[PDB]
Design a binder for this molecule. Structure first.
Ligand SMILES: COc1ccc2nc(C)c(O[C@@H]3C[C@H]4C(=O)N[C@]5(C(=O)NS(=O)(=O)C6(C)CC6)C[C@H]5/C=C\CCCCC[C@H](NC(=O)OC5(C)CCCC5)C(=O)N4C3)nc2c1
Ligand SMILES: [Zn+2]
Length: 198
């Protein structure tokens, strides 16, 4: 009934992948209980830093990546949800189910990656565990892992970046291509598709 209908909570930043120095590592900035309360209110006063955020809903956790002032992630993680911010929930600025893509204005204090113009095919995938995985580009939206590994290691990394050798954003991790549970390739949203959406 209408009186009882509930609202889905906001996506909440719960940590980040630190790429500042010479060592990549995940940092948690909010625990599960604070995440649930922040999802309900949409009010997140935590300071935000860096390019790759770890984000959560009540039921899922994944990544979000700032490129050109937009925090991008996958529709299969975020749906149409708002994101929590210091001033309350922020409505999506971009939503494209056909590309599995959504975006919000980048939070204050985040840093944005620059879209790649190098045309290079030697890529690097950044996971939620701060692994930097070499990936050879195989198409507009596909790349092969130089060292395959179980899909378990990639689960929760959708929304993370594929980067070129120079650290530019080449795409947003979308899906894993698996054979008997082993990931041999990945699918991603190319940054040009982001730049067109923009
Ligand atoms: C609901 O509206 C929409 C709209 C568009 C859409 N487009 C999609 C492409 C789409 O795929 C679905 C989600 C996505 C996914 O799991 N991604 C992540 C991830 O980490 N997720 S996550 O962070 O854990 C989570 C779950 C957000 C919290 C990186 C992969 C890590 C490990 C893989 C585990 C096994 C799943 C293998 C699937 N392989 C696959 O489909 O390969 C095809 C067949 C398609 C392309 C190459 C060949 C797969 O990867 N899948 C299925 N769902 C949608 C849903
Ligand atoms: Zn580049």
């Amino acid at each position: 009934h209408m009186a009882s209908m509930k609202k889905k909570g906001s996506v909440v930043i719960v940590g980040r992948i630190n790429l500042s120095g010479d060592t990549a590592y995940a940092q948690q900035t909010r625990g599960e209980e604070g995440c649930q309360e922040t999802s309900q209110t949409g009010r997140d006063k935590n300071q935000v830093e860096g390019e790759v955020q770890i984000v959560s809903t009540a039921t899922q956790t994944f990544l979000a990546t700032s490129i050109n002032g937009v925090l991008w992630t996958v529709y299969h993680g975020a749906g149409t949800r708002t994101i929590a911010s210091p001033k309350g929930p922020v409505t999506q600025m971009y939503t494209n189910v056909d590309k599995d893509l959504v975006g919000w204005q980048a939070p204050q204090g985040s840093r944005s990656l620059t879209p790649c113009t190098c045309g290079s095919s030697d890529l690097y995938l950044v996971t939620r565990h701060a692994d930097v995985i070499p990936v050879r580009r195989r198409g507009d939206s596909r790349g092969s892992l130089l060292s395959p590994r179980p899909i378990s290691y990639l689960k929760g990394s959708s929304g993370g970046p594929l980067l070129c050798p120079a650290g530019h954003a080449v795409g947003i991790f979308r899906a894993a291509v698996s054979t008997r549970g082993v990931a041999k390739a990945v699918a991603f949203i190319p940054v040009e598709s982001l730049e067109t959406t923009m």
